[PDB]
């Protein structure tokens, strides 16, 4: 009541090392680390495979 608290519960699913993506868990960001929104290019880099086996389901 004195202040407004907004708490989100999230779940680790994978880690970026650099310009690429690893899949895994058991990885812990230290407290006070910044949290961002994912950009669309970062998202569409994932969910995309080599052009020989791409099936655009929508």
């Amino acid at each position: 009541k004195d202040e407004d608290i907004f708490i989100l519960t999230v779940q680790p699913v994978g880690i970026f090392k650099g310009e690429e993506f690893f899949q895994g868990n058991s990885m812990l960001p230290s407290p006070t680390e910044p949290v961002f929104l994912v950009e669309d290019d970062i998202l569409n880099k994932i969910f995309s495979n080599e052009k020989t086996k791409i099936f655009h389901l929508g």
Binding site: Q23, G24, N25, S26
Partner: protein
């Protein structure tokens, strides 16, 4: 008589329980089906139930 089994399967809930229960040691890779993980938990020795929660995470 000199014959042993080393069972290999992806659906432990489908393999007959009356041989899988005969296994004494286990090589457990990643499991993603909850119905299979529950079975493998219940079949494991008691000392490994606590450490067995890694199966969905092993990669």
């Amino acid at each position: 008589y000199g014959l042993s089994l080393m069972v290999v399967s992806q659906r432990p809930s489908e393999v007959s329980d009356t041989i899988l229960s005969q296994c004494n040691n286990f090589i457990n890779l990643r499991l993603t089906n909850i119905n299979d993980q529950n079975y493998i938990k219940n079949l494991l020795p008691d000392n490994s139930r606590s450490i067995s929660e890694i199966l969905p995470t092993l990669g």
